[PDB]
């Protein structure tokens, strides 16, 4: 017994079918479409499309999942302590969200992750691509060039120190122009454009199967202005989160999202909390917050299903995201 409500049927065909008095697909499977159309007053096209959509609609256990996640590596951050606290870097097949006060280094982290995703597997990278979707216009090519130059300098240094021929073999292809051609750029100035780009993502990822990272630098800005109806915003945010997690699990990606902080006057001493309400709080697999403390930037893990929350210091150098 399978109720017809559990199928992606059009409301009209569903309502006329249940008005006829059918409540199981097991007997719709063998009914000839001619008398089917005659009985419920429909044509052949809707009958055949209903039949195919009904008939159209794997067995992986924990061991296979463990093996698969061990096969694919982690995205390096060039911050050793941040890699240690996160289990080895940014995990794949999961949605990661970063919050923080303005001018704290979220865009620098996004740029570094875009650069770091192209490290060859021999050195310990993932060797993939990157997709950058900008909603604020804060993507400057000069900073990316500087970060890539610093990364290639460090990579050459460590390769020379290792003194291994296989390391040299994976460097001539690792040139500035090649790595900087593997970052695909978009720009959505409105939340509708961002949603449309999100709907268009799966085909783009089907075309380019080497992509292993998707960055959406700023999701609060499109949704925090000119939107009086809160329910519509909540529905859009929930749908976007579901689509992003579906994309991450289907294409083996690492979704990176950026958020904003908002002052909350609790008790009498105001403190900063992430924006977009409380329902959005558990829409991301991992949540990270960047503090300021006293002239010292701290990266504190907030929510994760793998590691306990702690605190790690960091700072930004003219070479990019670094530790110490």
């Amino acid at each position: 017994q399978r109720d017809l409500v559990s199928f992606p049927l059009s409301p009209a065909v569903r309502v006329k079918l249940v008005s006829a008095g059918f409540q199981t697909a097991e007997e719709l499977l063998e009914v000839k479409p001619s008398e089917l159309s005659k009985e419920v007053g429909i044509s052949k096209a809707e009958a055949l499309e209903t039949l195919q959509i009904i008939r159209r609609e794997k067995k992986c256990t924990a061991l296979e999942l463990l093996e698969q996640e061990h096969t694919q590596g982690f995205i390096i951050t060039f911050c050793s302590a941040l890699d240690d606290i996160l289990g080895g870097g940014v995990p794949l097949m999961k949605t990661t969200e970063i919050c923080g006060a303005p001018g704290v280094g979220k865009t620098q982290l996004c740029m570094q992750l875009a650069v770091d995703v192209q490290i060859p597997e021999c050195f310990g990278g993932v060797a993939g691509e990157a997709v950058f979707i900008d909603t604020e216009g804060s993507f400057m090519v000069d900073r990316v060039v500087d970060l890539a130059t610093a990364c290639i300098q460090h990579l050459q240094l460590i390769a020379e120190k290792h003194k291994g021929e296989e390391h040299r073999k994976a460097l001539e292809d690792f040139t500035l122009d090649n790595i900087l051609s593997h970052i695909y750029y978009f720009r959505c100035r409105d939340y509708t454009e961002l949603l449309a780009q999100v709907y268009l993502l799966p085909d783009f990822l089907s075309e380019h199967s080497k992509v292993r990272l998707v960055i959406v630098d700023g999701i609060a800005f499109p949704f925090r202005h000119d939107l009086d109806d809160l329910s519509l915003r909540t529905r859009l945010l929930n749908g976007l989160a579901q689509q992003m997690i579906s994309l991450a699990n289907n294409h083996r990606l690492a979704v990176i999202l950026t958020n904003q902080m908002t002052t909350k006057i609790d008790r009498n001493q105001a403190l900063l909390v992430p924006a977009l309400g409380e329902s959005w709080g558990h829409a991301a697999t991992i949540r990270l917050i960047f503090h300021w403390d006293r002239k010292q930037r701290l990266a504190t893990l907030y929510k994760s299903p793998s590691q306990k929350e702690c605190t790690v210091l960091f700072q930004i150098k003219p070479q990019g995201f670094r530790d110490t």
């Binding site: 409500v5 059918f22 067995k59 256990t61 519509l232 997690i245 991450a248 699990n249 697999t285 793998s306």
Partner: protein
Amino acid sequence: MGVLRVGLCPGLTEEMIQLLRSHRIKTVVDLVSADLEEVAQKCGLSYKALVALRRVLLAQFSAFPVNGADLYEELKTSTAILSTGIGSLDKLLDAGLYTGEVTEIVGGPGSGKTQVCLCMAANVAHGLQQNVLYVDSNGGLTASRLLQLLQAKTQDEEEQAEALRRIQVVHAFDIFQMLDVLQELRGTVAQQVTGSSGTVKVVVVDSVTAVVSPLLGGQQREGLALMMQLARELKTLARDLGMAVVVTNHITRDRDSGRLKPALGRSWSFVPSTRILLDTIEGAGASGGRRMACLAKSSRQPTGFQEMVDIGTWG
């Protein structure tokens, strides 16, 4: 009933269905609602064959009520007791968890719902040696945490390797995918009535809110129907096939007008059988694995009892 098929009931022919659908009476519901005398003499059909057909049609479509005592002795052995690692709910649940009920946990961000699900699944798979099916909808599962939890109870590689392969995981991100997965599970277990091993006894849904939350909103009505259908099929699965089903959920408005309440509105409140409201402590002793567990609805024992559960030092 749909169109006439051979084998549905004895003594069926095309003349019968032709005359009945000419008389504006085809389905079983209006045929039995209409008087048997009316169709018998008004249409002139034979009374004996008509009454025999009606009785054999009802009998093969009905559920005959049974006595209570006998089913009680059979349920004495059909049921089972599942322990997770803490007895706070165990004492307040007639000294044992119920296999065949819909229990659920409501908790906010970082509460520990999936941690409870993970530890319970590990305990069920390893200690009691049965297959378990886990359904994830937001990527909340990591196999490293399962391995770490298993290592806290065993130190042998073979046991860890064997335990993992009996935990089946499937990804469903839309309500149609979840419905298809559950229907496939129902069909497979119906086909596996002969077998005695390999049948999953515990079914866990990581998050039922996230899947159905986009479907709500507006002034329409299809989302409520979809969630009610999902609840009905979950209840039928758990009752008929004797499985323990555990789902999670979120909380709603905490303002002055509305107390801390489970999500999905009022209609979802009637669905589950047991509610556990995880919470975090404030002030001294915060952070870490210190979480306050409470029993909101049990419908079997007095409620409103608060306890302590540690996860950081547990497993």
